[PDB]
Ligand binder design. Structure first.
Ligand SMILES: [Ca+2]
Ligand SMILES: [Ca+2]
Ligand SMILES: [Ca+2]
Ligand SMILES: [Ca+2]
Lengths: 91, 91
């Protein structure tokens, strides 16, 4: 199914991406900054100072674990979905 | 980006699929049964009686709203991700 590739694509991208530095399956704030710059950047910019990341990162951490777990990581992935409104409703 | 198609593919599939019956952006238990049978079926089966759906549906509803909202819908989408363990770690 087309959704199977979408789901499978995310895991393959996450584990390969999460295995860049530090323990696998653990996104650090420094690692989070790299992911946003490389992955989410064409639709969102800003982030010019670490303090801007510290506020967003702490807010991102629902449990305040200081890092972004796989479970929350899916939330942020969804937030990018729930954040953007449907723009395909216009001709 | 390849993730942009994955995200966009989900919304296009959800709104077109959620617009099958009832108000748009509202998944009913009867609608939920159709989605699982058509979308999530090649990896999961069971579901032979409505009572099996009623237990799973009520459990699925984190807030017990009786229906599956777009936000929770993403959870169930993730649950299919967090439910299946990574099998790509084996040669
Ligand atoms: Ca990592
Ligand atoms: Ca966190
Ligand atoms: Ca519907
Ligand atoms: Ca619910």
């Amino acid at each position: 199914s087309e959704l199977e590739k979408a789901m499978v694509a995310l895991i393959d991208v996450f584990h390969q991406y999460s295995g860049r530095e530090g323990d696998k399956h653990k996104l650090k704030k420094s690692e989070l900054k790299e992911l946003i710059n490389n992955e989410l950047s064409h639709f969102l910019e800003e982030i010019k100072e670490q303090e801007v990341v510290d506020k967003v990162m702490e807010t991102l951490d629902e449990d305040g674990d200081g890092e972004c777990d796989f479970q929350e990581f899916m939330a942020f992935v969804s937030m990018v979905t729930t954040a953007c409104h449907e723009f395909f409703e216009h001709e």
